Ligand binder design. Structure first.
Ligand SMILES: CCC(CC)Cc1ccn2c1[nH]c(=O)c1c(Cl)cccc12
Length: 112
């Protein structure tokens, strides 16, 4: 079944909060995180990041009704932002944006 159950609808609220967040200047910080480059495009990422994750993969898992609870999805987002902060250096834009969204995610969960 394709219909979103009540649990999926709650997961999708959290997913949308992260996806649609804009910073104080209107910048959509999620955009870079939708799609990780493939193994052929960025092989060194797959050497050191043991569990590659992007928001397309999370969303597909969510839409397939494969998350058992809100916490399971939050853990994949947390993994994704930790991966970004590991592969990318602290001076980088993506590292800074991963921190902001990681906090948005945690506060969204706490207030749910
Ligand atoms: C911006 C400099 C790019 C340097 C190749 C890094 C780059 C390009 C896209 N993505 C990343 N780094 C990520 O870690 C990452 C993650 Cl978690 C999820 C989805 C996309 C990602």
């Amino acid at each position: 079944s394709k219909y979103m159950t009540p649990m999926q609808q709650k997961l999708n609220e959290v997913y949308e909060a992260v996806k649609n967040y804009t910073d104080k200047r209107g910048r959509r910080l999620s955009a870079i995180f939708l799609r990780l480059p493939s193994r052929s495009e960025l092989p060194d990422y797959y050497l050191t990041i043991k569990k590659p994750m992007d928001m397309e993969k999370i969303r597909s898992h969510m839409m397939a009704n494969k998350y058992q609870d809100i916490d399971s999805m939050v853990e994949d987002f947390v993994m994704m932002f930790n991966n970004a902060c590991t592969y990318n250096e602290p001076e980088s834009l993506i590292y800074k944006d991963a921190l902001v969204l990681h906090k948005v995610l945690l506060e969204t969960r706490r207030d749910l």
